[PDB]
TrEMBL record, chains A, B:
Matching NCBIfam families: deglyc_PfpI (NF040823), PfpI (TIGR01382)
Protein name in UniProt: Peptidase
Source organism superkingdom: Archaea
Ranges for domain DJ-1/PfpI: 1-163
Family that this chain belongs to: Belongs to the peptidase C56 family.
Organism of derivation: Thermococcus thioreducens
Length: 166, 166
């Protein structure tokens, strides 16, 4: 499968890099999109190459979407193209994984009404206001949406997400 | 299986943390041992709990061994108990995974004569002097010893290693 990550500077380093490797291990292709090509740098100083700018991405091209946390979602969520990619993939029933602040992008895409999931507890109220049910669990699987809270949950997040990939 | 990590302050964060989650994902128990119980902190500022002090560890109680890199192996290799644990597990043919500077622990255990593997290139000459054949590959499998070089190799390192925990 072709697996798309949306991110920017200030990502939570582990939430992007450990899944990047986990999904490569399976033999899938992984792409990182952001505002421009180049590299981006996490909260903790790791850097990651960016394959694509948002504007080059066609939603039909990719099979699955990963939304890592950190401070990156706060600025990604303002980008109209990033939102659209997310809306289109989410509503088409493609596997979407989120962790930590990642659901801020889902909130802005307007796709959470009637859905169930989790996030970092510091944005629980925002998730609920977007129309979702929020629960405090290490991983939640609501159809195509696999959600976790924080870096301690990584093993469970990836366990359930990798099942959806074919 | 019970899988044992030996580390200390100044570990390369990804090299300890991404495998810890990968291996939990599979349903194995994972234990981190260091000089004392508490927390250790990596080069990039992530913290991990230490479950056991070296002195609590019985070699025979664990099924497999992971040796992450960073600056931790330079101090771990001085601990007689860590070296004893390493030697016994490695000589019993239990799966041992090293990356980066990890093999400094193997050097000091005295187990590398006639073996074959890789490391960070900056300690190639020390691995060779310890009696091993050094090669430059993303992952090398020499019997029970699975070795890689740096964080770019992680996906390949874990792919081959998790095979041995079957």
């Amino acid at each position: 499968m072709k697996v798309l990550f949306l991110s920017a500077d200030g990502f939570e380093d582990l939430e992007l890099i450990c899944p990047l490797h986990r999904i490569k291990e399976e033999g899938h292709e992984v792409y990182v999109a952001s505002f421009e090509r180049g590299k981006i740098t996490g909260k903790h100083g790791y850097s990651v190459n960016v394959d694509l700018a948002f504007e080059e991405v066609g939603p039909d091209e990719f099979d699955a979407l990963v939304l890592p946390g950190g401070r990156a979602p706060e600025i990604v969520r303002l980008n109209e193209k990033a939102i659209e990619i997310t809306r289109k993939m989410f509503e088409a029933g493609k596997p979407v994984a989120s962790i930590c602040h990642g659901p801020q992008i889902l909130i802005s895409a307007g796709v959470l009404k009637g859905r169930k999931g989790t996030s970092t507890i510091t944005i629980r109220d925002d998730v609920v206001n977007a129309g979702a049910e929020w629960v405090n669990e290490e991983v939640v699987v609501d159809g195509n949406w696999v959600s976790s809270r924080h870096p301690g949950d990584l093993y469970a997040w990836m366990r359930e997400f990798v099942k959806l990939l074919k």
